[PDB]
Design a protein around this ligand. Structure first.
Ligand SMILES: Nc1ncnc2c1ncn2[C@@H]1O[C@H](COP(=O)(O)OP(=O)(O)NP(=O)(O)O)[C@@H](O)[C@H]1O
Ligand SMILES: Nc1ncnc2c1ncn2[C@@H]1O[C@H](COP(=O)(O)OP(=O)(O)NP(=O)(O)O)[C@@H](O)[C@H]1O
Ligand code: SF4
Ligand SMILES: [Mg+2]
Ligand SMILES: [Mg+2]
Lengths: 527, 282, 325, 608
């Protein structure tokens, strides 16, 4: 209703003592659409509400606190120390009590195979991120198979994020060869080592059911089942009203009114490092391959008005996002969007000193009309951005054709392949913000869906990643963001308010923000 | 000596049915108002008020605003413009096609009639809405509504042509027309005085339900994302947008839906009244 | 009669076989399945162009590819989708989802509408026919998506008032129905009410208006009076003579009613989230897929033709002078 | 205890306009072995008083009387005992049976459902055998294969007889007939009367029969009830009612009956005017508007039935001035024949060996067609510019076919017709057009020949707009045209569907008289008129032919009207004319077996 959409230092999870909850209960919570691939390290399996479901089942090196703090996961590992200084040799010592769903233990080769799979030196894997695997010289077995030292070639200060935050560990049987990587898990997940496993991949009713791990090694969960039912945005809040799901996210004003206007449902809020944006395709063949055209159409989109309309009633004084690397709340955030300040008169001036002249309702050059295709998910909140953007762009004679796609194969079919002129989607980060640089904003980045880039950006990114002291690294990242802004790369629209709607009787599970869940603690009300 | 005519004998019977007269008056007032009102309102269509978001009815926006800050009165007037013009044009053209097919089929007779009705049966196999939705991929992002009007009309004449021919065929094998020939009436005068009065009023009462059918088809198409596109509005698009907020801010869904239901009620009432006036005691 | 129906279905088969051909030509002229593939910014190579045009039969003439489509659509497989997924793997399980809704809605609507129309005709102007007439008017005069949305947002409050979760509107079934066959039947019965109500309301409102006129016509003719002048009570006379005579015009409109119900099922399934044939139709038209649409129009036409054949069976049953005897 | 004992019956229909009181207090009774006839004009509330005894009136009618079948008051019953009396102790032949049969049932399996309602344990085989053996007692031609026909393939005089079969199926204790001899011809109705007399004699049942013909009453009925405006005007035995009329309305009702011993052109005595509306009904005697003996006392109150003789009552006050005198005196007119024959030699129609055949159709798709109807077989007619030729036969003879043959003005399959002098083989459509304004026709069935969606003014004035007539002289002629036959200027705005059967027969006559032709072909134009309106139209035709010298091709189902019009009669059987002559050596001396028994089945106009 009234707060700030900035990254904070506390979470709203409805903490209760794990013991004083129930010992069962079904967690019904929805999903965008049935995942096409279950390898989160793959380009089409890399998704937010796929990794979120897979968080429970797979290992993870570090527990991330409410403010970005890091503690070793004593339940999966025992000792993760940074031994050597100039070439960093971080030593991952695995628990002897960690097994995989199939019974094969976890060991050094399980980590080596993953680090080589996302290393990027073999192009057969269709990876989605190469976070730190391209800066590691080699992975050597420690004194025991459990132990596994990792020698770093180039200095990587953000080494805690390989198997923490967004990324987790996967069995070597799924990362050993490209066949199992790319084509291994299109019908169901492989081995897993978490408190919960998936047991029912019902595609006739469009439901995924997660149940407890028989081989679980930590404190056994209070819950018993977690069923995901895929469900479009149109009917997701009515599903909550009529008691078919338990927790969702609130995106618009109505979604927020009909969650506290009803009884039994409580609304939690804790913002995180997530944001929406317009992604522009500069790949040769796109009407927007012209840098000057991108920079002249960026001035014709009012981002302040878009933010104010988009988050109205969710955040007091809604303001847009003005940084690609950081978000409001993280250290080292500032306004770098002075080059793209909204000025529709200057847009017309340098759009007629570029060639498209206003002959009719929309401009045309050499015969082709100035029309741009917009690709977005057909939801209630996402299309408002499109409508405001097209209304504002019509004021300078630019046609924005809206194409609202479904949830199935939105990325794998349209975004990863280049079938768009402008794209609408969001990024979900973690306590580790400098990992997005190579992944997205590098010229050869694995998530550079628009193929926009320049050598200067790459050199700047290398300069930031080659520096250890955070104070200078933050300023260098800010400089890289200025370079990105003066390129027509993309337009960050809004941050995330982080308001989820949960049933009031559900505990240890809400909006976490910068922290992560303890899946062995989520329980239900003991009436 | 003061014998009244026949055309002025049917109009008086329509006038003495106040329900149909009121329904016709309401329809005509709506159609004229959809074009007269917009240059009176304090806020034009297609322009957004960004500090008047989701406001209730009042003194700047009388019918309230929208999730995007649009006046819900100007928007619904424009949507009504499009949704009614489409229906009227489609009804007229489809009635013309139905007449010019059923009349020729029923007058020719024989094998010509047999094949011309077998073709209609064939066109009736697959439900019309899905046949039209199949061709919406084209004519979807065009400016003029001409293609949509033609598409809706080309799949809306079959059922009414069935009855047009079914009554032409049975009327030409009658006895009063034979008596008319026995008197000295010409072949064309027989048609003008006996057939045209029969199938010129069945068409009239058919093109009052054609309007309702065309409007239903158009809103059903524009509701699913086909038909009419985002920058411009229709009644179906307005209802589709407003579904998700009826519970909390009901003015954004109750109003366009109530307008559409009122238009359809008036159309059906007019059809019933015209049928009762042109066919007095059935 | 066993000869009245042979020639009655021998031409239904021809009508189906020709409607499928014409519809295939239509959705091959009106669809461009390679547009979203061709218009990729890093324009995809000539190979993937040719390979995807080959995997869909788009390198062949229209007729020589309809021949190939039917040649093994009659054998079980219906070809890939735009992405390469098979169609037959999903067609068999969506046919049932749509058929359950269609059969329930049609059976309830065509019965309720006939009963209401006949009753309102025998009570021509009392304060029980006026109510049903002005109710059928305002049910027929609202589109089906409006009815579905109003039903949802009104029927939520009933569940709030009672609290036993009498009916819900999400999906066709609900997770966790692990009891006996009676729990698993009560679950689907609870889920099936509202969509079936939405379809049945439109069907009944449409049918009652025809039934009222059909019954008034036979109430005008004085053969019911003759029937009850020989010792038939005025209820038996109506049922045995007047209703039997007035049901004849309805068998010629049942097929069109079923077609309208099939049209409404698309909106109903979309609004209530039923993974059946209407949702697949919307999906396959939005993504411009020829195989999905080709498989769906055949099913819809078959439903309409079967409804016509059943109406012909009933029409012969209650009218003995339309059979050859 | 009697069979009816009706007492003070009164029916009131509640239409939108002020209630119409069809019956206003009649009371009578019927005995076991007697026949009681109820005669009157149209609108006189006779059917409303029968359909009220059986209880089959609409729900919008208020009936209040004391009708009691055998001491059992029938007005408070509840359609559970009512439909136990109905059928078993009450037979009801309806008036117009053109829609009185269920279309989806075979006629045999209707005359059988009738039987097996009141005899439940009888068998669907014995019941059907009894139905088919009733179908031949009624007189239908081939009972065994016509007991398998649906009502839509029946003549009309055959479905008029299926109703009689249904009514008499269960041997009712009191059958009630309402004009059961309209669609029949002379021989068929003769044998139907024989069936009714057999029911009255072997069983001993009363017969409440309503008639439009007064020759049936004179030879069948026993008592008589004259009804005018919802009251029984007079009650007497047939021998008394005849030759003791005793009251002006029955005086003019019995003086307007056609007789088979009349000279050529004797004029009947119709009662002039129209019956009241039964809605307003000003005070005084209802006949005061039309009564030739009205006095200022005949308007102070409605008279009531008092006794003037033994078993003879009349609702009149000055009934002492009616005894002895004849209708030609009471109404002060003359009944003579000044134009006995319009002497002339101008042949206007001459047929020679006419033949006509229809290619028969029974099947649908691949019929193995066998046989055909030979409607006409070689007849030869002739007319003389100022005289009528009467054509009489039985149903199926071919009279209507011959009438149409002459009217197409085209060459026939075989023969040589000579309309107005010239063989119609040099004249095609345009030449025949100028000859189509002096030869016209009155269709047999008034219902189909009139367009059901044109008002009366448009119907009557189509033969005038089409021909050489303008506008100011069209409204003028339609004016006098619809007063000559009896209609009114307001009726012009009325549609055909809201007219009675006899009222829309007169529209056809008026329409065919618009152009004042030289030849008129009439196909039973008096088939649905009461005895008084019909006498008005016979008088019209006779004097129209006198002053203007018209020519008629008159065909009719009764022969007493033909005696009053025709100068030459053509008895015609099975598609061939078997006897032509002078209408005095045909009706006064039959010399073919057929015409002998065709005259022997014509009811005598006076009681024995
Ligand atoms: N169903 C009805 N509704 C309204 N008025 C009726 C109805 N039936 C009869 N009447 C009126 O009752 C009066 C007599 O009608 P009816 O009983 O048909 O007379 P009738 O003398 O038996 N006719 P007919 O057999 O031709 O000589 C007239 O005023 C009619 O208009
Ligand atoms: N359209 C037709 N098809 C077949 N047979 C016909 C047709 N019209 C007339 N007939 C036959 O022609 C013969 C005479 O018919 P019609 O001329 O109506 O006789 P009618 O004795 O003059 N009739 P009516 O004046 O009512 O007693 C009968 O055998 C009919 O069945
Ligand atoms: S009472 Fe008077 S008006 Fe009536 S019939 Fe007798 S004389 Fe005529
Ligand atoms: Mg009557
Ligand atoms: Mg005839």
């Amino acid at each position: 209703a009234d707060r700030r959409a900035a990254v904070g230092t506390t979470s709203d999870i409805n903490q209760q003592d794990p013991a004083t909850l129930q010992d069962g209960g079904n967690l019904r919570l929805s999903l965008t659409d049935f995942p096409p691939n279950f390898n989160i390290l793959h380009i089409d399996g890399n998704n937010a509400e796929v990794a979120a479901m897979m968080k429970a089942t797979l290992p993870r090196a570090f527990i991330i606190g409410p403010d970005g703090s890091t503690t070793v996961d004593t339940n999966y590992f025992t000792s993760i120390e940074l031994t050597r200084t100039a070439p960093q040799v971080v030593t991952y010592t695995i628990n002897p009590e960690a097994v995989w769903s199939d019974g094969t233990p976890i060991t050094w080769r399980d980590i080596a195979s993953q680090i080589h799979a996302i290393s990027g030196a073999d192009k057969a894997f269709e990876i989605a991120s190469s976070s730190g695997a391209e800066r590691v010289a080699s992975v050597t077995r420690g004194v025991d198979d459990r132990q596994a030292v990792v020698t770093f070639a180039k200095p990587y200060a953000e080494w805690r994020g390989m198997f923490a935050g967004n990324g987790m560990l996967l069995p070597a049987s799924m990362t050993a060869t490209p066949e199992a990587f790319n084509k291994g898990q299109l019908d169901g997940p492989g081995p897993s080592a978490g408190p919960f496993v998936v047991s029912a991949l019902d595609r006739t009713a469009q439901r995924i059911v997660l149940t407890r791990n028989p081989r679980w090694w930590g404190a056994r969960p209070r819950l018993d089942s977690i069923t995901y039912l895929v469900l479009d945005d149109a009917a997701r809040l009515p599903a909550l009203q009529n008691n078919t799901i338990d927790a969702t996210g609130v995106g618009t004003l109505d979604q927020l009114t009909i969650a506290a206007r009803t009884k039994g449902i409580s609304i939690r809020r804790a913002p995180g490092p997530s944001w929406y944006h317009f992604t522009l395709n500069g790949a040769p063949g796109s009407i927007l391959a012209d840098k000057a055209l991108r920079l002249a159409i960026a001035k014709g989109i009012d981002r302040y008005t878009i933010a104010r309309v988009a988050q109205y009633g969710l955040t007091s004084d809604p303001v847009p996002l003005n940084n690609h690397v950081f978000v409001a709340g993280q250290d080292g955030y500032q306004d770098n969007s002075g080059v793209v300040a909204y000025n529709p008169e200057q847009a017309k001036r340098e759009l007629d000193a570029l060639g498209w002249r206003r002959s009719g309702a929309f401009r045309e050059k050499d015969g082709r009309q100035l029309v741009i295709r917009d690709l977005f998910y057909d939801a209630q909140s996402t299309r408002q951005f499109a409508q405001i953007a097209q209304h504002t762009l019509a004021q300078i004679g630019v046609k924005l054709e809206l194409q609202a796609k479904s949830g199935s194969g939105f990325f794998s079919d349209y975004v990863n392949v280049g079938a768009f002129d402008i794209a609408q989607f969001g990024w979900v980060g973690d306590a580790f913000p400098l990992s997005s640089l190579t992944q997205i904003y590098a010229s050869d980045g694995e998530s550079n869906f628009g193929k926009i880039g320049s050598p200067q950006i790459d050199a700047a990114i290398e300069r930031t990643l080659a520096e250890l002291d955070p104070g200078k690294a933050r300023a260098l990242a800010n400089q890289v963001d200025e370079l990105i802004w003066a390129e027509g790369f993309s337009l960050p629209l809004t941050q995330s308010p982080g308001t989820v709607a949960v049933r009031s009787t559900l505990a240890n599970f809400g909006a976490t923000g910068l922290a992560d869940l303890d899946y062995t603690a989520i329980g239900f009300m003991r009436r | 000596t003061e014998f009244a005519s026949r055309r002025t004998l049917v109009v008086r019977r329509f006038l003495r049915n106040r329900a149909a007269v009121a329904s016709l008056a309401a329809l005509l007032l709506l159609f004229v108002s959809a074009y007269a009102l917009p240059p009176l309102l304090p806020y034009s269509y297609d322009d957004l008020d960004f500090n008047a978001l989701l406001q209730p009815p009042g003194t700047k926006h009388w019918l309230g605003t929208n999730a995007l800050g649009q006046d819900l009165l100007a928007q619904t007037l424009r949507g009504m413009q499009k949704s009614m013009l489409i229906g009227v044009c489609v009804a007229v053209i489809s009635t013309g096609i139905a007449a010019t097919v059923g009349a020729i089929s029923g007058y020719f007779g024989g094998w010509r009639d047999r094949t011309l009705m077998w073709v209609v049966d064939l066109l009736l196999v697959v439900p019309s809405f899905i046949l039209i939705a199949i061709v919406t991929p084209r004519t979807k992002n065009s400016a003029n509504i001409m293609f949509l009007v033609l598409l809706l009309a080309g799949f809306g004449w079959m059922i009414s042509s069935r009855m047009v021919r079914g009554m032409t065929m049975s009327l030409r094998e009658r006895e009063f027309i034979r008596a008319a020939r026995y008197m000295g009436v010409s072949s064309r005068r027989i048609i003008v005085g006996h057939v045209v009065p029969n199938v010129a009023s069945i068409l009239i009462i058919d093109a009052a339900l054609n309007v309702a059918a065309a409007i239903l088809a158009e809103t059903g198409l524009s509701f699913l994302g086909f038909g009419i596109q985002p920058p411009d509005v229709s009644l179906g698009t307005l209802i589709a947008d407003g579904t998700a907020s009826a519970t909390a801010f009901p003015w954004v869904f109750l109003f366009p839906a109530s307008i559409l239901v009122l238009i359809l009620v008036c159309a059906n009432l007019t059809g019933d009244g015209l049928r009762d006036a042109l066919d007095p005691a059935s | 009669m066993t000869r009245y129906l042979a020639r009655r279905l021998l031409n239904y088969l021809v009508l189906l076989a020709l409607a499928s051909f014409l519809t295939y030509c239509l959705t091959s002229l009106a669809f461009s399945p390679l547009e979203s593939l061709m218009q990729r910014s890093p324009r995809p190579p000539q190979a993937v162009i040719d390979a995807k045009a080959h995997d869909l039969g788009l390198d062949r003439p229209i007729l020589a590819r309809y021949a190939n489509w039917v040649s093994h659509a009659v054998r079980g497989d219906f070809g890939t989708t735009i992405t390469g997924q098979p169609v037959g793997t999903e067609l068999g399980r969506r046919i049932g989802v749509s058929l359950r809704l269609l059969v329930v809605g049609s059976v309830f609507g065509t019965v309720a509408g006939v009963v209401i129309g006949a009753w309102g005709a025998i009570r021509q102007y009392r304060l029980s026919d006026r109510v049903m007439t002005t109710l059928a008017l305002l049910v027929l005069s609202t589109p089906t998506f409006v009815v579905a949305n109003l039903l949802i947002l009104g029927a939520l409050r009933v569940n709030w008032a009672v609290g036993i979760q009498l009916f819900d509107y999400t999906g066709e079934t609900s997770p966790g129905v692990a009891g006996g066959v009676w729990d698993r039947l009560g679950d689907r019965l609870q889920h099936l009410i509202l969509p079936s109500l939405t379809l049945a309301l439109a069907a009944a409102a449409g049918f009652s208006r025809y039934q009222r006129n059909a019954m008034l016509d036979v109430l005008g003719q004085d053969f019911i009076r003759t029937a009850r002048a020989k010792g038939l009570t005025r209820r038996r006379a109506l049922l045995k003579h007047g209703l039997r005579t007035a049901l004849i015009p309805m068998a010629t409109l049942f097929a069109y009613g079923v077609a309208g119900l099939v049209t409404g099922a698309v909106f109903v399934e979309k609004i209530f989230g039923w993974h059946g044939m209407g949702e697949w139709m919307v999906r396959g038209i939005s993504t411009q897929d020829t195989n999905i649409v080709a498989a769906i129009t055949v099913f819809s036409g078959a439903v309409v033709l079967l409804a016509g054949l059943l109406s012909d069976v009933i029409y012969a049953a209650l009218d003995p002078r339309v059979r050859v005897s | 205890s009697p069979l009816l004992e009706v007492t003070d019956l009164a029916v009131t229909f509640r239409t939108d306009g002020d209630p119409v009181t069809a019956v206003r207090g009649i009371s009578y009774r019927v005995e076991p072995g007697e026949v009681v006839a109820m005669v009157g004009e149209s609108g006189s509330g006779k059917s409303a008083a029968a359909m009220a005894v059986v209880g089959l009136l609409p729900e919008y009618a208020q009936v209040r009387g004391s009708v009691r079948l055998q001491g059992t008051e029938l007005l408070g019953l509840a359609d559970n005992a009512m439909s136990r009396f109905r059928g078993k102790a009450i037979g009801t032949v309806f008036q117009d049976p053109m829609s009185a049969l269920t279309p989806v049932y075979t006629v045999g399996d209707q005359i059988a459902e009738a039987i097996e309602v009141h005899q439940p344990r009888v068998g669907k085989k014995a019941a059907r055998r009894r139905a088919v053996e009733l179908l031949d007692l009624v007189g239908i031609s081939q009972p065994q294969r016509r007991s398998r026909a649906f009502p839509h393939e029946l003549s009309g005089g055959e479905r008029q007889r299926v109703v009689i079969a249904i009514a008499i199926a269960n041997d009712p204790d009191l059958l009630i007939c309402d004009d059961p001899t309209t669609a029949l011809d002379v021989t068929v109705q003769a044998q139907i009367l024989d069936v009714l007399k057999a029911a009255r004699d072997v069983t001993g049942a009363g017969v409440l029969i309503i008639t439009h013909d007064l020759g049936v009453v004179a030879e069948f009925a026993d008592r008589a009830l004259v009804m005018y405006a919802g009251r029984v005007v007079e009650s007497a035995g047939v021998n008394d009612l005849y030759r003791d009329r005793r009251m002006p309305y029955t005086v003019g009702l019995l003086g307007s009956v056609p007789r088979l011993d009349a000279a050529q052109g004797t004029r009947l005595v119709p009662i002039p005017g129209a019956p009241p509306s039964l809605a307003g009904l000003a005070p005084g005697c209802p006949f005061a508007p039309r009564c030739p003996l009205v006095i200022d006392e005949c308007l102070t109150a409605e008279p009531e039935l008092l006794d003037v003789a033994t078993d003879h009552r009349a609702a009149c006050i000055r009934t002492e001035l009616v005894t002895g005198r004849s209708a030609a005196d009471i109404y002060r007119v003359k009944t003579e024949a000044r134009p006995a024959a319009l002497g002339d030699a101008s042949v206007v129609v001459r047929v020679r060996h006419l033949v006509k055949t229809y290619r028969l159709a029974k099947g649908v798709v691949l019929r193995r067609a066998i046989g055909e109807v030979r409607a006409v077989d070689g007849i030869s007619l002739e007319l003389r510019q100022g005289r009528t030729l009467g054509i009489v036969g039985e149903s199926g003879s071919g009279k209507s076919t011959t009438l149409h043959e002459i009217l197409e003005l085209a060459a026939p399959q075989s023969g040589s017709i000579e309309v107005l002098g010239t063989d119609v083989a040099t004249l095609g459509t345009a030449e025949r057009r100028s000859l189509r304004r002096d030869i016209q026709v009155v269709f047999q069935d008034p219902v189909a020949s009139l367009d059901p969606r044109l008002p009366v003014f448009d119907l009557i004035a189509e033969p005038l707009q089409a021909n050489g007539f303008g506008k100011n002289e069209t409204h003028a002629r339609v004016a006098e045209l619809l007063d000559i036959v009896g209609l009114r200027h307001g009726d012009a705005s009325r549609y055909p569907a809201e007219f009675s059967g006899g009222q829309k027969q007169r529209i056809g006559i008026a329409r065919a008289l618009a152009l004042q032709p030289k030849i008129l072909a009439l196909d039973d134009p008096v088939s649905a008129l009461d005895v008084s309106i019909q006498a008005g139209i016979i008088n019209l035709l006779l004097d129209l032919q006198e002053q203007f010298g018209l020519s008629y091709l008159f065909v009719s189902h009764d022969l007493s009207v033909v005696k009053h019009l025709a100068h030459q009669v053509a008895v015609m059987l099975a598609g061939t004319v078997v006897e032509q002559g002078d209408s005095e050596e045909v009706f006064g001396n039959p010399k073919h077996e057929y015409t002998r028994r065709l005259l022997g089945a014509v009811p005598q106009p006076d009681p024995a």
